[PDB]
Design a protein around this ligand. Structure first.
Ligand SMILES: Nc1nc2c(ncn2[C@@H]2O[C@H](COP(=O)(O)OP(=O)(O)OP(=O)(O)O)[C@@H](O)[C@H]2O)c(=O)[nH]1
Ligand SMILES: [Mg+2]
Lengths: 170, 15, 8
């Protein structure tokens, strides 16, 4: 019709940059302070490849103590950004737990997902680009290197996810 | 910044 | 268009 709608969920360990990526997409601003999330939601209209879309984006908690809220957003969400920080190897190892829970909750092996390696503006890193690309290939999904600080790859991560859901629906 | 599942390992597509 | 997408 006139508009399409996509339910996107941003997931990953605490402090990797989920809120900063979302806020850079929606407000065109970089958040320097770390305000740990419980659960925030945004709705933003965009045009992706000529399609007017309303993106409903849920910005989730990385802190372990909010893990009981995962089942609900996993059932609802249509696509997931699996975010890790390239200087946080623990957050990269935690990606598998999120992908496994999504798979179990949605009872599906083809749920739209994108692996995101954030903080690409840093001068050093502990997770190699090849290591993250290798994991994303094992999942059959794209991997995007982003910087919420410089805005590099931010639209690429969210729009690649929208394109995957659009294709999934067909 | 995009590394597709079919791309050479660590090679991004910028087109 | 959906009025409450997390709850045509
Ligand atoms: N250098 C750099 N710092 C970043 C980047 N993205 C986020 N940060 C910083 O990392 C910290 C945490 O970012 P948030 O986006 O709040 O982290 P989060 O993943 O939402 O965390 P939780 O809500 O607790 O799960 C903040 O100080 C951000 O400014 C980035 O691309 N580059
Ligand atoms: Mg947050």
């Amino acid at each position: 019709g006139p508009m399409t709608e996509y339910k996107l969920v941003v997931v990953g360990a605490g402090g990797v940059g989920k809120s900063a990526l979302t806020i850079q997409l929606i407000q065109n601003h970089f958040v320097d302070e770390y305000d740990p999330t419980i659960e925030d939601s945004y709705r933003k209209q965009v045009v992706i490849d000529g399609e007017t879309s309303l993106l409903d984006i849920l910005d989730t908690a990385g802190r372990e103590e909010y893990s009981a809220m995962r089942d609900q957003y996993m059932r609802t969400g249509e696509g997931f950004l699996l975010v890790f920080a390239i200087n946080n190897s623990k957050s990269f190892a935690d990606i598998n737990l999120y992908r496994e829970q999504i798979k179990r909750v949605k009872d599906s092996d083809d749920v739209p997902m994108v692996l995101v390696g954030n903080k690409s503006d840093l001068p050093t890193r502990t997770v190699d680009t090849k290591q993250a690309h290798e994991l994303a290939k094992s999942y059959g999904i794209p991997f995007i290197e982003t910087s919420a600080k410089t805005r590099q790859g931010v639209e690429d991560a969210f729009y690649t996810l929208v394109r995957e859901i659009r294709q999934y629906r067909m | 910044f995009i590394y597709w599942p079919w791309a050479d390992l660590g090679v991004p597509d910028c087109g």
